[PDB]
């Protein structure tokens, strides 16, 4: 029952937090997810000819 | 002491056999003056020092 | 949930006393002693792992047939392919240049 | 009094050298026919760190002249020697960095290292990182080269004594500050039990000539005779002078 | 220990000199569909190794049980 209510977003406000933001969820773990999303999408587009290798290379460095 | 030398185990076997009270019939012997076993040992009282 | 014991008298976490937990046909977890992992044979020239050779602890190499321990070439299970290629090139070229060295010396005479 | 720290060292118990991780003694090849009369070629197979030592070592492999086998030597690497390089050792070897020549066979001004004191001693002088000997003269009648050592001492040696051309590698080691006690700790862990060091004035009289007193102080001259006996030689032994050296130390 | 596929190979094993016992186990299994069928495993004991032939078709099974030698001491189940 408690786990369900947490799924819906309860019990999670400032007065229920005791670890830091990073201790709760490391900012590195958030970056690695993000950059792995962007790298995946770029590879997909390039491989389907939605983008060329020249736009790919520039976007990869901007990601 | 689970993994023990034979020499240690042989000494322990000797100690097992000696750990007994005096046989009662000794007391009946003619001119007997042995009352009890005066060299009895116990693991809680005195250590063997190997 | 269920906790396990070492199966031997060594109680310490040494390199030779590693366990994995395994579930048995009796439905219970149990430690299983693991042997140390084998390293791949390495080339005598460059140091790289040799392709085609089995990876085993040393004495296990005695139990297995010769095809597991070699490859079909000069220096088979000893030097890698690119190391053998350099040996052949170098042997051929230096032995030729030796013929030229002598002739150039024999002309100047 | 009790036996002082500097006297305990000779018994060599806890004060022996920590040699577990060393590669073997660095030494030239044994001086044999080939080296006396011609040269022999070896290959540099490896260049490798030796625990305790600044300079890296070079594992040089030579063929045996009399038996079908190889013979690994352990040289102290000169600056510039590389894996795969051939090294030439003997009377007739050419004047290139890494080669082993008799000192008779090199011009004045040659830089050498790992020089033998006596011929066939297998190496003695200029072996620490960044050091070398300079040849400064020949006496072909007496068969004696003259050389300048790292200390700045001049010295006359047999012209048959061998050296390696060039300077020992790993130079400039002692320019980086150690910074931390811990770095000195790890340095001396691979050498011997010489560190850290308690000052004699921080001890009691029983333990050191300097010990004791209601202030820490030496109390007699710190300069000690050369003829003093064990237990007295603490401080500055046989000092010609003392105090800050105002100038250059070179001859 | 060892599964043997070829029936020609299996029959060689039954006639081998060290082979004194065999076993015939019947499993009730289910295929890709929920239709059930009687798998049979023939197992011959050997010396170093037990060898099993798995026969799913109960026709071929019935033939195979007949063609075992009468020297071989066969345990049904």
């Amino acid at each position: 029952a408690h786990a369900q209510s947490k799924r819906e977003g309860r019990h999670s406000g400032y007065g229920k937090r005791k670890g830091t933001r990073e201790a709760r969820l490391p900012s590195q773990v958030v970056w690695i997810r993000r950059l792995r999303v962007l790298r995946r999408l770029l590879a997909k587009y390039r491989d389907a000819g939605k983008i060329d290798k020249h736009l790919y290379h520039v976007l990869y460095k901007e990601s | 002491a689970a993994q023990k030398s034979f020499r240690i185990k042989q000494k322990m076997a000797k100690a097992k056999k000696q750990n007994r009270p005096l046989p009662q019939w000794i007391r009946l012997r003619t001119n007997n003056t042995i009352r009890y076993n005066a060299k009895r040992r116990n693991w809680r009282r005195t250590k063997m020092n190997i | 949930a269920q906790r396990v014991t070492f199966r031997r008298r060594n109680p310490y976490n040494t390199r030779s006393n590693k366990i994995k937990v395994v579930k048995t046909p009796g439905g219970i977890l149990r430690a299983q002693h693991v042997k140390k992992l084998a390293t791949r044979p390495k080339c005598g020239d460059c140091g790289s792992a040799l392709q085609g050779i089995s990876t085993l602890r040393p004495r296990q190499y005695a139990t297995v047939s010769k095809t597991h321990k070699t490859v079909s070439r000069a220096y088979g299970g000893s030097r890698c392919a690119n190391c053998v290629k350099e040996r052949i090139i170098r042997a051929f070229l230096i032995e030729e240049q030796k013929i030229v060295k002598k002739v150039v010396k024999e002309q100047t005479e | 009094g009790r036996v002082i720290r500097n006297q305990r060292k000779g018994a060599g118990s806890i004060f022996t050298s920590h040699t577990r991780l060393r590669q073997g003694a660095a030494k030239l090849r044994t001086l044999d026919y080939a080296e006396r009369h011609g040269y022999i070629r070896g290959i540099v197979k490896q260049i490798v760190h030796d625990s305790g030592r600044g300079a890296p070592l070079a594992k040089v492999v030579f063929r045996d002249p009399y038996k079908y086998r190889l013979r690994e030597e352990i040289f102290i690497a000169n600056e510039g020697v590389h894996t795969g390089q051939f090294i030439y050792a003997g009377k007739k070897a050419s004047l290139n960095v890494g080669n082993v020549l008799p000192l008779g066979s090199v011009p004045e001004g040659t830089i050498v290292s790992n020089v033998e004191e006596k011929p066939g001693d297998r190496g003695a002088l200029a072996r620490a990182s960044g050091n070398y000997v300079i040849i400064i003269g020949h006496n072909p009648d007496e068969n004696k080269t003259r050389v300048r050592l790292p200390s700045g001492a001049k010295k006359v040696i047999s012209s048959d004594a061998r050296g390696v051309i060039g300077v020992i590698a790993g130079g400039g080691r002692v320019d980086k500050p150690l910074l931390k006690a811990g770095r000195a700790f790890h340095k001396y862990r691979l050498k011997r039990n010489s560190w850290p060091k308690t000052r004699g004035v921080a001890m009691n009289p029983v333990d050191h000539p300097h010990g004791g007193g209601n202030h820490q102080h030496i109390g007699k001259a710190s300069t000690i005779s050369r003829g003093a006996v064990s237990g007295q030689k603490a401080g500055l032994i046989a000092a010609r002078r003392t105090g800050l050296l105002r100038g250059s130390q070179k001859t | 220990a060892r599964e043997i596929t070829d029936i020609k190979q299996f029959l060689e094993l039954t006639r081998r000199a060290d082979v004194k016992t065999a076993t015939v186990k019947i499993n009730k299994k289910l295929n890709k569909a929920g239709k059930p069928f009687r798998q049979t495993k023939f197992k011959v004991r050997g010396s170093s190794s037990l060898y099993t032939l798995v026969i799913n078709d109960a026709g071929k099974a019935k033939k195979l049980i007949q063609s075992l030698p009468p020297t071989l001491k066969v345990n049904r189940l």
Partner: protein, 91 residues
Amino acid sequence: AKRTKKVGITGKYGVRYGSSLRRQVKKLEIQQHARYDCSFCGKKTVKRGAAGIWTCSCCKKTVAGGAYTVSTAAAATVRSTIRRLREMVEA
């Protein structure tokens, strides 16, 4: 963003040890961790591995060198001296 005005690699030492010692360590720390140009294969892949030992990642050739840089000034002047004397004896 530029993260330190000056300490650079020596920012790992915090405020300890003295500016003058940190500054001397910094010069040699930069040299010892630099990539150097390989004399053999031409690539910029020579890195220190223990004082005096400089190895190329690409071609795998190791060279004996200085404690904190591949070539000390003393060893350069020696190479040049030895070349000079070698040419004097060879005519």
